[PDB]
């Protein structure tokens, strides 16, 4: 034993869905109200999940990004993916399929650890129904979690569930 197990997590999804808010809420217990678009940021947190101490290495991605070769590099290194949309933005939900395809393509695999995340569940302007999202997740064979970076609902659960998925995969 040389140190706690390490997991490489990538947070992906359309611009504005709250990928950064979720990550910052996890790491710093802080909600960011301001919208500062991200290019690429890396974070690290030690947690205990199901009695195993482990180290989450988290890559926060950009939503607004085209073809890049830098992009495909970290999808190759990443062991698990949080695919985030916002429950008040139907476009970000439809984009989920595109994110999953990019991942499946680069990892050259049908069975990649993933979790579907419906963020901003605190907002009253919901446009994507929970049942719809559960059905999408059921069809992909992956878990679905509703989160709010603001209230903190589901945040820990989302990351911990992803880790549990990576564990099952090996
Ligand atoms: N009400 C509410 N607002 C949220 C939530 N998550 C993020 N936001 C808000 O939505 C905006 C976008 O959040 P942000 O984390 O920057 O989104 P992002 O996916 O990281 N954007 P980008 O892809 O450009 O980096 C911020 O103003 C933030 O306050 C949430 O769960 N609830
Ligand atoms: C290539 O694809 C990946 C994919 C996903 C995550 C990672 C990853 C994330 C964070 C770290 N670690 C890290 C290093 C420095 C700091 C900054 N320190 C001040 C804490 C934070 C995290 C390392 C790798 C790499
Ligand atoms: Mg971001």
Author numbering: -2 to 167
Paper text:
The RAS family of oncogenic proteins is important as therapy targets because of the frequency of activating mutations in almost all major cancers. All family members function by signal transduction to the nucleus of cells via interaction with effectors (such as RAF, RALGDS, and PI3K) that catalyze phosphorylation of downstream proteins. When KRAS is bound to GDP, the protein is in the inactive state and becomes activated by nucleotide exchange from GDP to GTP. Mutant RAS proteins remain in the active state and hydrolyze GTP at a much slower rate than wild-type (WT) RAS.
We used these analyses to design of cross-over compounds linking the common diphenyl-anchoring moiety of PPIN-1 and PPIN-2 to the Abd-7 aniline fragment. All three compounds showed very similar binding modes to Abd-7 with van der Waals contacts to K5, L6, V7, S39, Y40, R41, D54, I55, L56, G70, Y71, T74, and G75. Ch-1 was found in four of the six KRAS169Q61H chains (A, B, C, and F); Ch-2 was again found in three of the six chains (A, B, and C) and Ch-3 was found in four of the six chains (A, B, C, and D). Thus, by combining the anchor constituent of the PPIN compounds with the aniline fragment of Abd-7, we generated a compound series showing good electron density for the entire molecule when bound to KRAS pocket 1. While the interaction of the high-affinity WT iDAb with RAS was minimally affected, even at the highest dose of compound (i.e., 20 μM), both the lower-affinity–dematured iDAb and CRAF binding to RAS were progressively impaired, starting at the lowest dose of 5 μM. Phosphorylation of AKT (downstream of RAS-PI3K signaling) or phosphorylation of ERK (downstream of RAS-RAF signaling) was determined following EGF stimulation. The PPIN-2 (and control Abd-2) had no effect on the levels of phospho-AKT or phospho-ERK even at 20 μM (addressed using Western blotting), but we found that the three cross-over compounds caused loss of phospho-AKT or phospho-ERK, as did the previously described compound Abd-7. The potency of the two of the cross-over compounds (Ch-1 and Ch-3) is improved, relative to Abd-7, as these show IC50 at 72 h of 5.3 and 4.5 μM, respectively. Structural comparison of the six chains in the asymmetric unit show that compound binding has a minimal effect on the conformation of the switch regions in RAS protein.
